[PDB]
Amino acid sequence: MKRIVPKFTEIFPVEDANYPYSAFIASVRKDVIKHCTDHKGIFQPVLPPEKKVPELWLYTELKTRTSSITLAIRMDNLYLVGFRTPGGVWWEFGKDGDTHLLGDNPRWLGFGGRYQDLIGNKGLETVTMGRAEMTRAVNDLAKKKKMLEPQADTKSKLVKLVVMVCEGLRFNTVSRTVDAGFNSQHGVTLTVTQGKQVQKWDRISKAAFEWADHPTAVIPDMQKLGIKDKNEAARIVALVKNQTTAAA
């Protein structure tokens, strides 16, 4: 009826690091590229426009030693729209405004998904990423119920998961950062350049299109990150939003 069920779910044992993060992303990447379309002058696969009720969407489950979390990636945005607690409820990014995408009406996370939520003045880039912090984050999200006291703490844990996992599907840069770092005992710590550029994927999706018709343009938006070339963009990113064919 109103619920748009995902076809299947991709379940991933996080604790057993047998497969690299490169292979993890590659597996999901191949299937989403099938859904994307080409565009002239854009090497990167281009997403479809935003359907509210598509044919399907990407449902993924990160399962650790002790805990399980499902994350809902709408294929049309490749954004983490919502989540499943193992208590059998769902959550969605927003407040006082749910969507029937998560099946039955989810709860609301109350905030967005960026550094401005957690800290504002400081960056997110100080957060260590690694096997321990992923497992901790999954535990710390799995222990949630309809009410819990450390709202901001569980929120910072899901911010590192989205930047590692979801942005990783759109960004070879954070993918390879996490690939080298996840298997480490110390983990890795990102930088301001990576932190801001990944979450503002809209800036990538305009830059890639502006580089479409003009193969040697210079884009001041993207040059700030050291990315003066579409080649440099293509080896940093993986996928780009549906950009309507305006002018480039």
Swiss-Prot record:
E.C. no: 3.2.2.22
MF (Gene Ontology): rRNA N-glycosylase activity; toxin activity
Keyword set, alphabetical order: Cleavage on pair of basic residues, Hydrolase, Plant defense, Protein synthesis inhibitor, Toxin, Zymogen
Reactions listed under catalytic activity: Endohydrolysis of the N-glycosidic bond at one specific adenosine on the 28S rRNA
Active site: E167
EC top class, as a word: hydrolase
Pfam family, one: RIP
Superkingdom assignment: Eukaryota
Propiece span(s): 218-248
BP term (GO), one: negative regulation of translation
InterPro entries the UniProt entry points to: Ribosome-inact_prot_sf, Ribosome_inactivat_1/2, Ribosome_inactivat_prot, Ribosome_inactivat_prot_CS, Ribosome_inactivat_prot_sub1, Ribosome_inactivat_prot_sub2
Family: Belongs to the ribosome-inactivating protein family. Type 1 RIP subfamily.
Role according to the record: Potent catalytic inactivator of eukaryotic protein synthesis. It may be a component of natural defense mechanisms involved in protecting the kernel against soil-borne fungal infections.
Record text on subunit structure and interactions: Synthesized and stored in the kernel as a 34 kDa inactive precursor. During germination, this neutral precursor is converted into a basic, active form by limited proteolysis, which removes 25 AA of net charge -6 from the center of the polypeptide chain. Additional processing also occurs at the N- and C-termini of the polypeptide. A two-chain active RIP (comprised of 16.5 and 8.5 kDa fragments that remain tightly associated) is produced from this processing event.
Name of the protein in its database record: Ribosome-inactivating protein
Organism: Zea mays (Maize)
Lineage, opening ranks: Eukaryota, Viridiplantae, Streptophyta, Embryophyta, Tracheophyta
